[PDB]
Ligand binder design. Structure first.
Ligand SMILES: Nc1ncnc2c1ncn2[C@@H]1O[C@H](COP(=O)(O)OP(=O)(O)O)[C@@H](O)[C@H]1O
Ligand SMILES: C[C@@H]1O[C@@](O)(CO)[C@H](O)[C@H]1O
Length: 479
């Protein structure tokens, strides 16, 4: 009566196949890693792409490991990073390259859309934040720059649905991730005809978006037994929010990985002029609970620094960084210059120099700049969100790999002046498992699932310190 559910969670920096064991009567939820594998950008023929074939093989390797162990798999579910897609021909073969959202093909196109359609028009239709790599702009790039591919395209699948298709042979268009495209009309939960038209994409390439929980199809162990593949809240951030142990209207989340996604949950979207000016997004959530959030460039900046300076001990870097004084180097991490510069360290240094600040040069200084700059932006955004909804927050839940950074957890609490609760680490995996359990009739809703997480996961409390360096800094930049 315990259920064995497999979650595939693909992030920009890593993929993971994990196995959960759940039994309702016990309120016991355990999670084991089956297969962890690298993911990251590839330079391929002058483009920045994903190696989808290696990701698919890695997923299969993990699934086949569970099968060969003789475990009765009750379900499988897949979540990935948002926005990106794979084009398919009439026989399901890939068309063109699997270009990544970090690619520069889209440069200038978001401004073009605003000029031709109207910024307010796009925002009112979609309720989605302006990011220059939104799918809306990617499809414009594709149809403009690669017209010869167009007749060959039968379907476009967002990344999670692409892998679900490779496992089942069936196509799906999952709602929570569909909303990341800036192509879904917020009033209809269906593709917006005017936005599709501008992109050059064909409505026939898609299907009506379907809310999480449906059985997409089945996958088969080397044995022959049919295992349902479930559409989960397939946008990784949507899954992370599900597993965040939010406690009522006064709780916010910070989903911390490659990106930092800071937001709250709402029954209704915010598309007013305040939201528009703040560039706030209203992403689709399980249960129709909007994820009202902002993208923050996040630990991407550090990932790049680590590779450039050949740093292989991140815990040591964090410990060293703790000893450096705070707020000497402040950049705006959300500046477009940081999306994909060739030289991240140089870009951070240039930004600091431009602002008449000392230059962060040691490994620990670069890390310090990143952590303080993120924490100040966290405080800015949390303020914007509270102001927008007309309600303060009493706790901030930090989840994701980033929630292991105890330095950044405390900086966030101190800058925001809010209690921080860190954990679970693998929130996307857990929310993916949650929806699967719901389709199995083992769990009733997201709120019930969060009660499980809160009695199962390791949660660490960071109390705001009013006398901290960053708290003192924030106090000064108010008056
Ligand atoms: N032991 C650790 N201590 C502190 N931070 C960590 C640790 N392990 C990983 N991280 C942070 O977590 C990030 C990865 O978070 P994750 O949620 O897996 O990202 P993705 O968005 O790629 O799925 C890494 O870039 C790193 O900054
Ligand atoms: C493309 C970006 O990647 C994420 O899904 C985080 O992995 C984020 O929510 C999107 O904006």
């Amino acid at each position: 009566t315990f259920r064995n559910c497999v979650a595939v969670d693909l992030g920009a920096s890593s993929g993971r196949v994990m196995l959960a064991r759940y039994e309702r009567e016990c309120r016991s939820l355990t999670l084991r890693e089956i297969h962890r594998f690298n993911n990251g950008l590839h330079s391929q023929n002058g483009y920045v792409t994903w190696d989808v074939d290696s990701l698919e093989s890695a997923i299969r390797l993990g699934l086949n490991k569970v099968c060969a162990a003789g475990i009765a798999i009750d379900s499988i579910g897949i979540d990935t990073w948002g926005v990106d897609f794979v084009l398919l021909d009439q026989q399901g073969q890939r068309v063109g390259l699997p270009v990544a959202y970090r690619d520069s093909r889209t440069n200038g196109l978001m401004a073009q859309a605003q000029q031709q359609l109207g910024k307010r028009d796009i925002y009112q239709r979609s309720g989605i934040q302006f990011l220059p790599f939104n799918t809306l702009y990617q499809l414009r790039a594709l149809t403009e720059q690669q017209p010869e591919l167009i007749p060959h395209i039968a379907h476009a699948l967002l990344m999670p649905d692409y892998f679900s298709y490779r496992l089942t042979g069936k196509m799906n268009w999952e709602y929570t991730n569909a909303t990341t495209t800036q192509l879904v009309n917020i009033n209809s939960d269906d593709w917006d005809e005017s936005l599709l038209a501008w992109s050059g994409a064909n409505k026939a390439w898609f299907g009506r978006p379907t809310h999480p929980g449906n059985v997409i199809g089945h996958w088969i162990c080397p044995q022959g037994n049919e295992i349902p593949v479930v559409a989960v809240a397939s946008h990784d951030t949507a899954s992370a929010v599900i597993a965040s142990p939010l406690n009522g209207s006064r709780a916010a989340y910070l989903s911390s990985g490659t990106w930092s996604l800071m937001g709250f949950e709402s029954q209704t979207p915010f598309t007013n002029d305040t939201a528009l000016a703040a560039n706030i997004t209203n992403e689709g959530g399980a249960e129709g609970r909007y994820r009202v959030l902002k993208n923050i460039m996040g630990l991407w900046l550090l990932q790049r620094v680590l590779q450039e300076r050949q740093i292989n001990d991140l815990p040591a870097l964090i410990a060293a960084t703790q000893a450096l004084p705070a707020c000497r180097f402040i950049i705006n991490p959300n500046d477009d210059r940081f999306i994909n510069p060739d030289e991240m360290c140089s870009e951070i240094q240039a930004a600091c120099r431009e602002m008449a600040q000392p230059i962060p040069e040691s490994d620990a200084e670069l890390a310090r700049c990143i952590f303080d700059s993120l924490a100040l932006l966290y405080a800015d955004v949390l303020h914007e969100l509270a102001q927008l909804r007309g309600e303060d927050f009493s706790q901030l839940h930090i989840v994701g790999g980033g929630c292991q950074n105890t330095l950044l957890n405390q900086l966030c609490a101190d800058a925001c002046g809010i209690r921080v609760i860190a954990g679970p680490v693998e929130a996307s995996t857990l929310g993916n498992i949650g929806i699967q359990l719901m389709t199995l009739d083992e769990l009733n809703n997201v709120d019930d699932f969060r009660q499980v997480v809160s009695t199962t996961a390791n949660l660490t409390t960071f109390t705001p310190n009013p006398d901290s360096e960053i708290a003192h800094y924030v106090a000064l930049i108010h008056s």
